Amino acid sequence: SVPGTTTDGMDPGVVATTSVVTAENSSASIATAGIGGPPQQVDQQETWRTNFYYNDVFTWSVADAPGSILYTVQHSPQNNPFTAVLSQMYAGWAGGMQFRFIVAGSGVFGGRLVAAVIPPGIEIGPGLEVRQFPHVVIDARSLEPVTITMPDLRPNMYHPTGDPGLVPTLVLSVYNNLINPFGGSTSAIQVTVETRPSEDFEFVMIRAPSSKTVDSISPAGLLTTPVLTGVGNDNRWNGQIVGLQPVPGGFSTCNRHWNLNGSTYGWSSPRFADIDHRRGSASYPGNNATNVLQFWYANAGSAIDNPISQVAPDGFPDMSFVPFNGPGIPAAGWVGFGAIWNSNSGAPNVTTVQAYELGFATGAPGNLQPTTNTSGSQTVAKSIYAVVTGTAQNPAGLFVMASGVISTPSANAITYTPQPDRIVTTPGTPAAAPVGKNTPIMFASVVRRTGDVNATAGSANGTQYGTGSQPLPVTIGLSLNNYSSALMPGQFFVWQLTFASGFMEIGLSVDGYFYAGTGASTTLIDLTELIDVRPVGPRPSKSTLVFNLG
Amino acid sequence: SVPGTTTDGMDPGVVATTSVVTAENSSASIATAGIGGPPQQVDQQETWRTNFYYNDVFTWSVADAPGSILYTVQHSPQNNPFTAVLSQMYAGWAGGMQFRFIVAGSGVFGGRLVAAVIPPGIEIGPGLEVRQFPHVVIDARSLEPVTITMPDLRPNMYHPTGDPGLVPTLVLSVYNNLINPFGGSTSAIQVTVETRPSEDFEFVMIRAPSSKTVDSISPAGLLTTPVLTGVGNDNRWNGQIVGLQPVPGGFSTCNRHWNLNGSTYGWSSPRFADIDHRRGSASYPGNNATNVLQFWYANAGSAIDNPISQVAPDGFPDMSFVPFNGPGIPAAGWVGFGAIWNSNSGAPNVTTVQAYELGFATGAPGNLQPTTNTSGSQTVAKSIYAVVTGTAQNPAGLFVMASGVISTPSANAITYTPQPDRIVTTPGTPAAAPVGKNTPIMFASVVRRTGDVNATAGSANGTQYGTGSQPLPVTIGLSLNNYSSALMPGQFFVWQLTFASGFMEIGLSVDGYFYAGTGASTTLIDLTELIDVRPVGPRPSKSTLVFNLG
Amino acid sequence: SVPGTTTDGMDPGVVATTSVVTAENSSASIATAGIGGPPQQVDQQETWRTNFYYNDVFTWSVADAPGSILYTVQHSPQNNPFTAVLSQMYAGWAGGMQFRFIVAGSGVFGGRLVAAVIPPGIEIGPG
């Protein structure tokens, strides 16, 4: 006698059936996946085939209305942790995948879930009536686990590993509202999904693992655990990613930002190299050359320095110029150590090095003004400390270093300097807009300033944060490989970041922006207790990513 | 009827037996690998089990004496490309592995090979008499392929995936000298090894792939194909690796150099961050403060800035100071843009920024001299262009940027600036010494100079090369994971770099240095036609890595 | 009793299947392709589909290293001349294709040639 309180790892539970799961579907699936050859990895006694391994956990609270979708998984071999490894050596897959749901509710709870297999081609999100499909209702007082099989409802003969095609989706929405009859702060339960390949799952043809690898079939390995803790940098400042800064108003980033289509709209390679431009004019104001401020400018669209785009040279910051005159330190600007070289020789001049704020402006000879658009604007550089003498040569050149610091009028720290109101953007880039409760984020980093060199994290003067849209390993991996057949528009690729106290989720858009679901919250995430980063796969865009740091 | 000229992929050929392969060994191997549970991935009709997949190719010339070892493979599941993928989801393996040799010689050739399975615990290298083991002799005129089985001669119950233990080795040495009876330039043939798991091969217990991953069990993924082409940088200059510079005299690198034991002997993190030091003395010579050269110095061993070692602050170059006085540009020195800040406020001073050569010296107040040893020396910085005024404060601070350029007296390029005679090294580091025909290499990179800003690769003035011991992704992956149970001392981890014309091999020492076999050649490798990088596994240190670029 | 020096047009020679020529693959290819209606030009007595016909001749130098691609063809009706003539006559195809390789080398030569069938989802290039 086995009581229902304890479950075996090979135990399915109660095998709840749906009308999408038929014998005709299974017989057709084998008889048409036979074009791949004999079925591979179909030994029925293997431990990866027979045991249920962890897929996800999710929270069902009493504040969830009926019809509200709590869980959504796509049919993929990346659901299981072992068919995601076996798909590295095979060029196709076909068949089903069971999902076991364990609802950890007591007998005093009430309310029900619902579980329907949505056929492919149907939009998944709010407004999808799960209860009007062929469905299975699951009580919150259920003790034995309930398993349901995903049939392989596909239009293809088999799913190729790189581009699978159209796949069914599985949704767990609220059938009946969860009730705790007491009332209080203990109004949430949890359901755990595990997964196991069905009796009809298979891989069809073998291929070399030195072919299209794990970094080209899915963007799961772009965000690893050492990347977000202490190794990976950001794509704006080349500093350690020490936080997540939510942007509730939304932003847009053009330079050094790669989408999932493997193309950028900005003017920089995926690295931090020098800014070097030929034949941009330089001048100095007034006539006397004592304590003079060096000025340099060149029109956008004329910098033949990149093989990608020629609005600005490589490594140019996408920061608007805050104007400043005289001995006044500018506030919140990209400032890097630079120099001016003659074009006829290539020799940098002896005395005209300084901490030059680099940026974009609209009118160079008269009043300086900030700008966002690149069309009609000009790349403009100007030193922030006094330089004795200075070049006035019109075909002159500018050489600034790769990384930068923060221009601050005082030693006191300020907010994060790439605010969305001052970010240089070409015409044509998409905007990171909030989708429901999800909001765009930028990866913060400790970037030191010219008001305090020794300013690090936890300094008593205050920490200075610089934010970039993507991590540098993520945009490095995004420029080499293509994920067009990995995420349709209207979807995220969601990772689960677990901390020492709670856990949270961020998702990657098709356009390349990261999305944490915090609502209108703007509090910076600590990211120093981050222990685990693992991928969970494609999820709908209009679904709130779970966020609880405690 | 099947002629012997064409071979099937499932065809073993002639199954040549050795006295190490017995029935008692196989029965013992299954009966004692049963402690892992039932055998896994033992379905005999799988395509990865039945087909021979590529392992290596090697050249047998007429200049090879009898007893000279041409091929050496260790018993591992990384030999096969499919048991290297299946070992990501299992925590052990046990059993044998067949090797098929196809000798592409005509009937007019002569000479023979020999093939013995060396038991574990025996040193592999020159002086190993293969022909006095139980062996199989293979003619060069052989047409049908010949296969021999590796028995799993192990002292353990099974081999754990991370630390396998002691394994047999397989050697293909020259039994009889290859003769071409004509005489000429066509004196070489080729033998190809393929590999296939034996009937007794198995994996024993399953484990989560989110455990110890592919980046902790073997250093195969540290050197990937995009790393060595256009993405990975070096650990000294943060520039694109565009070549391999052989060092026939040998060198030693201390800073930012990680071994396979996951420990460094230098003073930098695996990134390119700023140099920032508190309470190091600054001064200026003479009395007048017009066009004065700024001097800064601080004793080694006193920089409380790192959690690793305190000889120098983070990002400090391991370059000896070449002395220079007056308006004379120094030659071959690490020079980066820097400044001086007061310790009492943290504010960097307005005018004292310049291109400061950063380095090590022995005597600061009198004559400046270069140094290599860190014990008793001092970190010393000095600007190379004139600065109006300058700080003389004794608790002052120094802030230099991460990347650097090359100090050149003229616009003309010179040789690679980190020469082995000027590299700052702590007492206790190992030296990269040549082992036979193999010589240490440093990964070159296009690093621009202060004589020509616009100097890039292929410039008509001449290219400037800066060399670092390891690639930055390699030393980044070496600092997070441990490869102590992956390479015993006296061995390399060899990758096969194939070009558009030929191919060559580099190997990674236990101490962390890279080794290409070019002899006394010092010609820089082009590395712009590099198309493939794949790993071949552990090989003996005293074996010449194959090198032919055409 | 042909000596092997002379080969017929209808003679395959020695047939070498790698691992992907399976019987149930052919059965799952034949029954699937009825979505185009009745199959056309299916008569295994016609001389256009029983004889081997020239596609493309290539060279093999001693300067070619191992791994260098000598002849690669995507699956098409254009690999056969009569199938390429009927390809403009029809609007779809389904089925395999036998490739026969004749090596013009004497007994004094040495070296081998690998031949694999790549699955359709695999990008073919340098790596």
Tab-separated table of C-alpha atoms in Angstrom, chain C:
chain	number	residue	atom	x	y	z
C	1	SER	CA	31.438	-12.116	-66.012
C	2	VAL	CA	32.353	-8.460	-66.560
C	3	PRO	CA	35.950	-7.675	-65.490
C	4	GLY	CA	35.004	-4.479	-63.645
C	5	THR	CA	36.918	-2.263	-66.064
C	6	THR	CA	33.778	-1.786	-68.182
C	7	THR	CA	30.637	-0.491	-66.459
C	8	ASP	CA	27.121	-0.363	-67.864
C	9	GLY	CA	24.910	2.699	-67.722
C	10	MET	CA	22.404	0.701	-65.665
C	11	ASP	CA	25.142	-0.689	-63.394
C	12	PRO	CA	25.297	0.927	-59.930
C	13	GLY	CA	28.515	-0.879	-59.033
C	14	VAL	CA	28.897	-1.272	-55.268
C	15	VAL	CA	26.073	0.328	-53.276
C	16	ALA	CA	27.110	2.056	-50.042
C	17	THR	CA	24.329	3.301	-47.753
C	18	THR	CA	25.592	5.384	-44.851
C	19	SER	CA	22.883	5.169	-42.190
C	20	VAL	CA	20.032	7.199	-43.706
C	21	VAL	CA	18.800	4.961	-46.550
C	22	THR	CA	16.171	3.044	-44.583
C	23	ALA	CA	13.129	1.146	-45.829
C	24	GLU	CA	10.563	2.853	-43.598
C	25	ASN	CA	12.020	6.209	-44.672
C	26	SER	CA	11.107	5.273	-48.251
C	27	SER	CA	7.696	4.031	-47.102
C	28	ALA	CA	7.048	7.285	-45.222
C	29	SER	CA	8.209	9.256	-48.266
C	30	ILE	CA	6.093	7.375	-50.830
C	31	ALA	CA	2.807	7.514	-48.897
C	32	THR	CA	3.251	11.162	-47.901
C	33	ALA	CA	3.817	12.456	-51.480
C	34	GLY	CA	0.223	11.588	-52.556
C	35	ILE	CA	-0.799	15.072	-51.420
C	36	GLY	CA	0.213	16.166	-54.912
C	37	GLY	CA	-2.261	13.745	-56.451
C	38	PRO	CA	-1.241	10.647	-58.373
C	39	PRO	CA	2.539	10.360	-58.818
C	40	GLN	CA	3.881	11.308	-62.237
C	41	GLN	CA	6.747	9.881	-64.326
C	42	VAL	CA	6.764	6.779	-62.112
C	43	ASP	CA	7.554	3.864	-64.413
C	44	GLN	CA	10.729	1.926	-63.633
C	45	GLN	CA	11.321	0.724	-67.189
C	46	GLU	CA	11.924	4.136	-68.783
C	47	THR	CA	15.474	4.767	-69.942
C	48	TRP	CA	15.654	8.223	-68.345
C	49	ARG	CA	15.386	6.758	-64.833
C	50	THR	CA	17.211	3.424	-65.205
C	51	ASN	CA	20.495	4.753	-66.635
C	52	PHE	CA	23.161	6.892	-64.999
C	53	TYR	CA	23.764	10.247	-66.683
C	54	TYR	CA	26.515	12.834	-66.350
C	55	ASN	CA	26.048	15.626	-63.819
C	56	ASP	CA	29.369	17.341	-63.061
C	57	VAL	CA	33.016	16.230	-63.196
C	58	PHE	CA	35.538	17.637	-60.735
C	59	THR	CA	39.218	17.380	-59.924
C	60	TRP	CA	41.046	16.169	-56.814
C	61	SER	CA	44.510	17.639	-56.292
C	62	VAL	CA	47.371	16.536	-54.043
C	63	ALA	CA	47.278	20.045	-52.540
C	64	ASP	CA	43.802	19.465	-51.073
C	65	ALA	CA	44.019	18.951	-47.313
C	66	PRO	CA	41.603	16.653	-45.451
C	67	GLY	CA	38.254	18.294	-44.826
C	68	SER	CA	38.259	20.302	-48.052
C	69	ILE	CA	34.906	20.109	-49.832
C	70	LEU	CA	35.243	18.869	-53.411
C	71	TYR	CA	31.648	18.430	-54.604
C	72	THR	CA	28.545	19.508	-52.696
C	73	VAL	CA	25.016	19.442	-54.123
C	74	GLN	CA	21.732	20.370	-52.498
C	75	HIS	CA	18.873	17.948	-53.188
C	76	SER	CA	17.226	19.059	-56.415
C	77	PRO	CA	15.950	17.828	-59.772
C	78	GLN	CA	18.865	19.806	-61.258
C	79	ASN	CA	21.437	17.142	-60.317
C	80	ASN	CA	20.237	14.977	-63.227
C	81	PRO	CA	19.822	16.274	-66.805
C	82	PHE	CA	16.528	14.559	-67.609
C	83	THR	CA	15.098	15.340	-64.190
C	84	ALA	CA	16.098	18.967	-64.802
C	85	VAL	CA	14.283	18.828	-68.147
C	86	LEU	CA	11.157	17.434	-66.460
C	87	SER	CA	11.567	19.959	-63.616
C	88	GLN	CA	10.338	22.733	-65.905
C	89	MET	CA	7.522	20.382	-66.948
C	90	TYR	CA	6.252	19.740	-63.379
C	91	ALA	CA	5.588	21.790	-60.237
C	92	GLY	CA	7.004	19.679	-57.427
C	93	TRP	CA	9.075	16.613	-56.658
C	94	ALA	CA	9.611	14.075	-53.890
C	95	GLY	CA	12.117	11.268	-53.568
C	96	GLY	CA	15.761	10.273	-53.385
C	97	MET	CA	18.545	10.266	-55.931
C	98	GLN	CA	21.448	7.868	-56.496
C	99	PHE	CA	24.872	9.431	-57.126
C	100	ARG	CA	27.495	7.245	-58.807
C	101	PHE	CA	31.165	8.148	-58.400
C	102	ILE	CA	33.825	6.964	-60.847
C	103	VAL	CA	37.424	7.615	-59.773
C	104	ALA	CA	39.997	7.921	-62.568
C	105	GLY	CA	43.025	6.687	-60.683
C	106	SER	CA	45.512	3.908	-61.227
C	107	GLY	CA	46.681	1.409	-58.638
C	108	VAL	CA	49.708	3.566	-57.791
C	109	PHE	CA	47.661	6.382	-56.239
C	110	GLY	CA	46.659	6.670	-52.602
C	111	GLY	CA	44.281	8.719	-50.507
C	112	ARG	CA	40.586	8.527	-49.709
C	113	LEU	CA	37.358	10.468	-50.207
C	114	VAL	CA	34.668	10.841	-47.570
C	115	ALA	CA	31.003	11.101	-48.546
C	116	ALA	CA	28.209	12.004	-46.141
C	117	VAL	CA	24.554	12.984	-46.401
C	118	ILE	CA	23.941	16.120	-44.348
C	119	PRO	CA	20.534	16.537	-42.675
C	120	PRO	CA	18.423	19.416	-44.047
C	121	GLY	CA	18.555	21.718	-41.034
C	122	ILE	CA	22.358	21.924	-40.910
C	123	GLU	CA	24.029	25.055	-42.255
C	124	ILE	CA	26.969	24.125	-44.488
C	125	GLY	CA	30.027	26.358	-44.408
C	126	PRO	CA	33.440	26.639	-42.758
C	127	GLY	CA	32.591	25.059	-39.399
